[PDB]
Short mmCIF file of C-alpha atoms and ligand atoms in Angstrom, two decimals:
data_model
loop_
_atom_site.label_atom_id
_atom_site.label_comp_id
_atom_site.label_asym_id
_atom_site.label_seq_id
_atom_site.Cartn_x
_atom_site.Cartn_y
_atom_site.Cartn_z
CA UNK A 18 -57.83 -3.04 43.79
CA UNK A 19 -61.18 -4.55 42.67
CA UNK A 20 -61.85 -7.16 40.40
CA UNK A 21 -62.86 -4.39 37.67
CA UNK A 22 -59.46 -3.37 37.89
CA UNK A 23 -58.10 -6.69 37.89
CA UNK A 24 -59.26 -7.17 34.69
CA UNK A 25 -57.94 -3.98 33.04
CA UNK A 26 -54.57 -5.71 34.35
CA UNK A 27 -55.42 -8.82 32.58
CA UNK A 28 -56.76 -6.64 29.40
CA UNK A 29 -53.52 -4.89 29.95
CA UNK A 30 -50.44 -7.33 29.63
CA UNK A 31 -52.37 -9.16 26.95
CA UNK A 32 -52.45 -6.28 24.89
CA UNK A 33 -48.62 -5.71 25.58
CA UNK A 34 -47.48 -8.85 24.74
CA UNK A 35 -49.59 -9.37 22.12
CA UNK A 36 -47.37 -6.14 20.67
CA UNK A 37 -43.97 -7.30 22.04
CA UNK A 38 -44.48 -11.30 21.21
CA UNK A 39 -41.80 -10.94 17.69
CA UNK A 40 -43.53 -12.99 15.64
CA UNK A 41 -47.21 -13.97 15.05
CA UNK A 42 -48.26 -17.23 16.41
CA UNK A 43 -49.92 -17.26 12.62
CA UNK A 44 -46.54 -16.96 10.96
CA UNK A 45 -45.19 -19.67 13.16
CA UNK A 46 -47.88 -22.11 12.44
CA UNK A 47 -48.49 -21.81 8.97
CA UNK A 48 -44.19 -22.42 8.72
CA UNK A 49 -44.24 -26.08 10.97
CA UNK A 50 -44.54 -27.62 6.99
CA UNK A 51 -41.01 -25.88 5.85
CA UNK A 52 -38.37 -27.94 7.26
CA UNK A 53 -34.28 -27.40 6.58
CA UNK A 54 -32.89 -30.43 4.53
CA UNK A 55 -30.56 -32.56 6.09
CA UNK A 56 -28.53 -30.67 3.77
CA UNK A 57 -29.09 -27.78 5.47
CA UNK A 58 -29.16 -28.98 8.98
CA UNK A 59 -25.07 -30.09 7.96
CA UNK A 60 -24.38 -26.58 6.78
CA UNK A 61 -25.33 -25.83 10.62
CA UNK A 62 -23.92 -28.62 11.92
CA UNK A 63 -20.36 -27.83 10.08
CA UNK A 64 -20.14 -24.06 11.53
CA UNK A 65 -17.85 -23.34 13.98
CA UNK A 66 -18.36 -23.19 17.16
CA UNK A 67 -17.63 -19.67 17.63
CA UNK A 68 -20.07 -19.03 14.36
CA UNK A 69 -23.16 -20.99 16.16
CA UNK A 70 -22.74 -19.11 19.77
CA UNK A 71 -22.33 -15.98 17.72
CA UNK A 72 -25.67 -16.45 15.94
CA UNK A 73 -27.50 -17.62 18.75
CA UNK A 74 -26.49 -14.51 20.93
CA UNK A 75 -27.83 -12.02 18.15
CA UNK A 76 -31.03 -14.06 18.06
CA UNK A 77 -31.16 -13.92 21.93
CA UNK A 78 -30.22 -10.02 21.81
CA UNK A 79 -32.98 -9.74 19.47
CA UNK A 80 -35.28 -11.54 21.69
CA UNK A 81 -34.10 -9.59 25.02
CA UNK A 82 -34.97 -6.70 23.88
CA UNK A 83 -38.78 -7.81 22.76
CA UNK A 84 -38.85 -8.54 26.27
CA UNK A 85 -37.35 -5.24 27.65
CA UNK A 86 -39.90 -3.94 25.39
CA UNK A 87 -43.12 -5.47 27.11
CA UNK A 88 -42.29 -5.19 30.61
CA UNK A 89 -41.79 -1.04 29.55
CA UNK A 90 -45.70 -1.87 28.80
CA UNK A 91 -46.51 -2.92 32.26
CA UNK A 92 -47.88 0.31 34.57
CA UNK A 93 -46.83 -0.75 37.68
CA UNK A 94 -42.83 -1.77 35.96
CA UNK A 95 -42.63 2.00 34.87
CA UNK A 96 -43.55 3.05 38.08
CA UNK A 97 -40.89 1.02 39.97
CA UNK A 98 -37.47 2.64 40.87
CA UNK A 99 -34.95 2.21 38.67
CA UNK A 100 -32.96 0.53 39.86
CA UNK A 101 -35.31 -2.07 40.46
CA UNK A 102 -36.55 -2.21 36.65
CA UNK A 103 -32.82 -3.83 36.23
CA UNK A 104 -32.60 -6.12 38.16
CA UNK A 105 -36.05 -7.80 37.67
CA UNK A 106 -35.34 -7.52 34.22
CA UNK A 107 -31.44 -8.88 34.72
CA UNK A 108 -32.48 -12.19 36.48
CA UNK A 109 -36.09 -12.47 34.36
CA UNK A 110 -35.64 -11.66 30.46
CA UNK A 111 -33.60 -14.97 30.15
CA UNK A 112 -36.35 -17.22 31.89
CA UNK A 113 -39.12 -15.28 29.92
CA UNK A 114 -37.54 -16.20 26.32
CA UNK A 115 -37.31 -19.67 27.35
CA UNK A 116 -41.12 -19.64 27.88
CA UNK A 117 -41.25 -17.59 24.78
CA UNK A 118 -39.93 -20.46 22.98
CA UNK A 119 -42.48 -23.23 23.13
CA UNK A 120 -44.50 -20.51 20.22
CA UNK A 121 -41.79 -21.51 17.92
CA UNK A 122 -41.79 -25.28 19.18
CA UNK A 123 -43.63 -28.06 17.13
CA UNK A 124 -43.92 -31.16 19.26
CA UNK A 125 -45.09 -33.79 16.15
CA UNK A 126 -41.47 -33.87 14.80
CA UNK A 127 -39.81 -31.88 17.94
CA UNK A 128 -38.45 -29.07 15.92
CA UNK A 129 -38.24 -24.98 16.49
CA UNK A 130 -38.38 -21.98 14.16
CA UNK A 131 -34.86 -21.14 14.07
CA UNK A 132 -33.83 -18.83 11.35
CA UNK A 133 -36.31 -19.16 8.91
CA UNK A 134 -37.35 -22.46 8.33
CA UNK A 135 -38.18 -25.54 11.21
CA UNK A 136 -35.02 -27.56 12.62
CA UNK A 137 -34.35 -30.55 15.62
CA UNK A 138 -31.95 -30.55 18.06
CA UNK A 139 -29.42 -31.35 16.27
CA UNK A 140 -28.95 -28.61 14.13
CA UNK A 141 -27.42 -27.01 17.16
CA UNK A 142 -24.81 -29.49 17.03
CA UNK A 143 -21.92 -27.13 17.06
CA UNK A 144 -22.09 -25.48 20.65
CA UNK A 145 -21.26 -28.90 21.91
CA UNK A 146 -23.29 -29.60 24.76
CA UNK A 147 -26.51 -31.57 23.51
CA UNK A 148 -27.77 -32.25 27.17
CA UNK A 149 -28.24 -28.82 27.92
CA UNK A 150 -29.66 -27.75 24.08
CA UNK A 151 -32.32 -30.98 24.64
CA UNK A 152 -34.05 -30.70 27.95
CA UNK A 153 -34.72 -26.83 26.70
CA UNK A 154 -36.25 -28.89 23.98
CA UNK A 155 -38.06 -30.99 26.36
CA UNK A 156 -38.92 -28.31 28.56
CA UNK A 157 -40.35 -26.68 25.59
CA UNK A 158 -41.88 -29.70 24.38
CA UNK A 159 -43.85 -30.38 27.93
CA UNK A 160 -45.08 -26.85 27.12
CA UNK A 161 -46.47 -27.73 23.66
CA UNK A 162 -48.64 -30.19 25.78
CA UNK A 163 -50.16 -27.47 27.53
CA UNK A 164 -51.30 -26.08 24.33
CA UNK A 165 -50.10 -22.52 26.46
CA UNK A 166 -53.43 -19.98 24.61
CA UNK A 167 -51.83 -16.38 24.02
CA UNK A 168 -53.48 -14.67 27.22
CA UNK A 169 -51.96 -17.31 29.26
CA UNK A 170 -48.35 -16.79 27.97
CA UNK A 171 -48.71 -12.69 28.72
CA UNK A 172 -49.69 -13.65 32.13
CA UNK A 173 -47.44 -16.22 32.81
CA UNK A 174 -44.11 -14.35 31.87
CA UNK A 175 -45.12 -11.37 33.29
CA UNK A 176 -44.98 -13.04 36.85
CA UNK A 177 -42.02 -14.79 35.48
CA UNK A 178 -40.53 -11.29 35.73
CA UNK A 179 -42.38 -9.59 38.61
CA UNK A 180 -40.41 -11.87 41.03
CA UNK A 181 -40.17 -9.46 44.57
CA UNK A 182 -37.64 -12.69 45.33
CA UNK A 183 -35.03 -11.46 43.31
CA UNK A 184 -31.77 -10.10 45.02
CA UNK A 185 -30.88 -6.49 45.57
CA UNK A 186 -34.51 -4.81 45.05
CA UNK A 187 -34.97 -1.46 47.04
CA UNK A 188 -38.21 -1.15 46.66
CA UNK A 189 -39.64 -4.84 47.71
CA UNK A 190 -43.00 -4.04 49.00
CA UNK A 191 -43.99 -1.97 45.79
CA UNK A 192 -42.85 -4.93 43.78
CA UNK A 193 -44.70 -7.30 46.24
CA UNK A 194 -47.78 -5.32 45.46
CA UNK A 195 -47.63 -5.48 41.78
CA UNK A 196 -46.40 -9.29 42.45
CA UNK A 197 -50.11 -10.41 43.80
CA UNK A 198 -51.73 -8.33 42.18
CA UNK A 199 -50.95 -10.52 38.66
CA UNK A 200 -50.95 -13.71 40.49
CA UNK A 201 -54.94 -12.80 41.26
CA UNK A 202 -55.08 -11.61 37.76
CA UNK A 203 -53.71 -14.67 35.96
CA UNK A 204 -55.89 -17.35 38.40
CA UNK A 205 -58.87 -14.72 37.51
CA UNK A 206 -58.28 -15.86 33.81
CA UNK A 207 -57.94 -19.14 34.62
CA UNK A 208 -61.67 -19.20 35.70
CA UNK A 209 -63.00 -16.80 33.09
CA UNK A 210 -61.55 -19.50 30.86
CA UNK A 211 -62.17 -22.93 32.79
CA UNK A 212 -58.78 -23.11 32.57
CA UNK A 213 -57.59 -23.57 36.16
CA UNK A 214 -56.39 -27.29 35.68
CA UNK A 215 -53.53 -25.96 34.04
CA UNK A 216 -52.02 -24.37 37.15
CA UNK A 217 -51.32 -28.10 39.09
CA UNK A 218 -49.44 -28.93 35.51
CA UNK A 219 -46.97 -26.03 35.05
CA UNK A 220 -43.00 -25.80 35.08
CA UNK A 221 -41.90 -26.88 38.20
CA UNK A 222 -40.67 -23.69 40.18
CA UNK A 223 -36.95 -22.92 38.94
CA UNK A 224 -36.69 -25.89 36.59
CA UNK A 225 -36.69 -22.93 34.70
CA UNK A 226 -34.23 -21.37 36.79
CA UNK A 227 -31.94 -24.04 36.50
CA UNK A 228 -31.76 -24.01 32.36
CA UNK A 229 -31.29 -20.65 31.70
CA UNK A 230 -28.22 -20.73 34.92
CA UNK A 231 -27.02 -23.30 32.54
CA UNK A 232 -27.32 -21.20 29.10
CA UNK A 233 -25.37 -18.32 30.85
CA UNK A 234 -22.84 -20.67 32.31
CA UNK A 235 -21.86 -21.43 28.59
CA UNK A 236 -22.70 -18.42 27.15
CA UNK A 237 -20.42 -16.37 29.54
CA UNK A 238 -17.28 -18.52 27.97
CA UNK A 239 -17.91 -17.91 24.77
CA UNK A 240 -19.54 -14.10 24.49
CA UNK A 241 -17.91 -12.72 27.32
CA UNK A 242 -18.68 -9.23 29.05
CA UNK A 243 -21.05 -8.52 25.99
CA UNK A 244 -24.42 -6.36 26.98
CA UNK A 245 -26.33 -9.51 28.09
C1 CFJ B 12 -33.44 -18.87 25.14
C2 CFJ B 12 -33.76 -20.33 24.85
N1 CFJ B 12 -33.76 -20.62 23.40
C3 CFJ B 12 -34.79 -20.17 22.60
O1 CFJ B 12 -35.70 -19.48 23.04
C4 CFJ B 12 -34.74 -20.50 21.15
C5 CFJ B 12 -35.72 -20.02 20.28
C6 CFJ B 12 -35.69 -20.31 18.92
N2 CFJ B 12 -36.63 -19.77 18.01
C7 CFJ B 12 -37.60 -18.85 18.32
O2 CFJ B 12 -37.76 -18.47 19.48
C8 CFJ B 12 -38.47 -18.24 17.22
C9 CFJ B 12 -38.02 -16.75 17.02
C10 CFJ B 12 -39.06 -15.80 16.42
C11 CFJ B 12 -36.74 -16.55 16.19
C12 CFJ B 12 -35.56 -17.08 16.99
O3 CFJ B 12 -34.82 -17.90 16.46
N3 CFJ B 12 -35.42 -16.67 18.30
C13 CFJ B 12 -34.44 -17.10 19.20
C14 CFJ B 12 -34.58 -16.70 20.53
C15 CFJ B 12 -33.62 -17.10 21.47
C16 CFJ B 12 -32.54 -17.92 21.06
C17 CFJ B 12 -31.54 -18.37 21.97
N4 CFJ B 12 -30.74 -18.73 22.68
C18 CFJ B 12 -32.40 -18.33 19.72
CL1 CFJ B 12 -31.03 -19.35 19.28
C19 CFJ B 12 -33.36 -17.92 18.80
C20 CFJ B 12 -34.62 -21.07 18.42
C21 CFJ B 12 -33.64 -21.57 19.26
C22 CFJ B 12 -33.68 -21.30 20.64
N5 CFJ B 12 -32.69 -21.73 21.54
C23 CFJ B 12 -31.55 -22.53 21.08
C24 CFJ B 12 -31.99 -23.98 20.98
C25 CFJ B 12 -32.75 -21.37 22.86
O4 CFJ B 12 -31.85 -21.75 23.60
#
């Protein structure tokens, strides 16, 4: 592959996520001013518990399947077996939506886009287990710092998912292949953009990995066996 074709692949997942991304980063920043009323931050906070989990899984199906949807617009995913397909997508999707999240994240008052208008932490109240609900705020938040461009989000999440590390792939050495292949890609941005200083400041490796094991060890009590 030569560099002409490593930028087709850069060209590529940018236009694919830039399809599959739910909402645009437009819509999200012009909404940062409307703000639920402590009013309406109780009416979340009074919900069940049961109510809350049952939202946020819908919201997280939702999400999924954005994500399902731009790893389909990846060549190289298509063209993997199967099998393989799953279980990249089974251990990834979940770490890719948290990334996702720091679109919807405004660090001046440390709020998200959650249904419709801009909320804290503490709207989330209900599912009982702030420490967890907060550092995905903070991890967010440390993201917000980055000021993460579009381009760099495509090509990050993409080799959050492309991950030949993951347990029970066939087919490792094509995966390997499409593996590097984005790594050279996304530093090959990172230069067309000056951007390369970003690279020494990113998530630490599995921090990631960590908070979304946590998300499914809570979400697997409450929504159990569904889809996801
Ligand atoms: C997966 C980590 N995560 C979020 O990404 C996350 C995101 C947002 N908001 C957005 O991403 C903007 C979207 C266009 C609309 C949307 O609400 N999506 C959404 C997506 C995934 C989940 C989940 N769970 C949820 Cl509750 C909602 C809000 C809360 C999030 N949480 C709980 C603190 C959250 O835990």
């Amino acid at each position: 592959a030569s560099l002409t074709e490593i930028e087709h692949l850069v060209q590529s997942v940018c236009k694919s996520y830039r399809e599959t991304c739910q909402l645009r980063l437009e819509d999200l920043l012009r909404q940062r001013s409307n703000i639920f009323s402590r009013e309406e931050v109780t009416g979340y906070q009074r919900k069940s518990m049961w109510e809350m989990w049952e939202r946020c899984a819908h919201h997280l199906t939702e999400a999924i399947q954005y994500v399902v949807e731009f790893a389909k617009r990846l060549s190289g995913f298509m063209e993997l077996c199967q099998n393989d397909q799953i279980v990249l997508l089974k251990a990834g999707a979940m770490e890719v939506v948290l990334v996702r999240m720091c679109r919807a994240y405004n660090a001046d008052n440390r709020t998200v886009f959650f249904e419709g208008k801009y909320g804290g932490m503490e709207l989330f109240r209900a599912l009982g287990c702030s420490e967890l609900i907060s550092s995905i705020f903070d991890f967010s938040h440390s993201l917000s710092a980055l000021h993460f461009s579009e381009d760099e989000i495509a090509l990050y999440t993409a080799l959050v998912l492309i991950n030949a590390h993951r347990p029970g792939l066939q087919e490792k050495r094509k995966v390997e292949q499409l593996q590097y292949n984005l790594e050279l890609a996304f530093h090959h941005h990172l230069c067309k953009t000056h951007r390369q200083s970003i690279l020494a400041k990113l998530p630490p490796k599995g921090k990631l990995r960590s908070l979304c094991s946590q998300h499914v060890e809570r979400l697997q009590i409450f929504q159990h066996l569904h889809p996801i």
